[PDB]
Amino acid sequence: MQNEEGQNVDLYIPRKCSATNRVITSKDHASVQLNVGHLDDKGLYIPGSFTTFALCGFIRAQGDADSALDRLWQKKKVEARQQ
């Protein structure tokens, strides 16, 4: 949200679920954030480089977090040349 002038007005921008697109609220203590490390040509972890995924409590309580994260990681690894 912005003013007519163009100033940012919101207190903060909440994160969104990587799978459901839902807004992750401040009291959502079932939500998690995961970093998947990247590997070089020799299968060694490159420090500081990873793909970040966030899951809201709703999807994790449903048990669908595993498959959603698997699909998201597969797509992101295909895009990022991590194989």
């Binding site: 799978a19 459901t20 697109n21 839902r22 709703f58 449903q62």
Partner: protein, 129 residues
């Protein structure tokens, strides 16, 4: 029996979006349904949808962005003049900054903002946001 195919389509999309599904199925298809979906897609509330031919009313598969809070039908289709749009939006939409009411006017099926722009009235079909 089936009375409003548009209601069934919108309710299926709403339930699927709440469940988090990436795709939903609409059966039977209709040109009113297609126009509603095109209005929704114009504003980024849905992805690509595909019509399936079966030598019958048809079928539609809709991609869901995850941006749809709620889409609904209004029944019966009340008469809405150009001056009643403000009241209808106040009744139905969460805010004046976003959200759309779909009307069927003699100029075609369109959202309420376009109806205000063209100064055309008609009948209310539904809403989405």
């Amino acid at each position: 029996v089936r009375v409003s195919v548009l209601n069934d389509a919108l309710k299926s999309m709403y339930n699927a979006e709440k469940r988090g599904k990436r795709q939903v199925m609409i059966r039977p298809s209709s040109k009113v349904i297609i126009k509603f979906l095109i209005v929704m897609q114009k504003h980024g509330y849905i992805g690509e949808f595909e019509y399936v031919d079966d030598h019958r009313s048809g079928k539609i598969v809709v991609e869901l962005n995850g941006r749809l809070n709620k889409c609904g039908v209004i029944s019966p289709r009340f008469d809405v003049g150009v001056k009643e749009i403000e009241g209808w939006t106040a009744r139905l939409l969460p805010s004046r900054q976003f959200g759309y009411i779909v009307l069927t006017t003699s100029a075609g099926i369109m959202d309420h903002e376009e109806a205000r722009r063209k100064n055309v009235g008609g009948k209310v079909l539904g809403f989405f946001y």
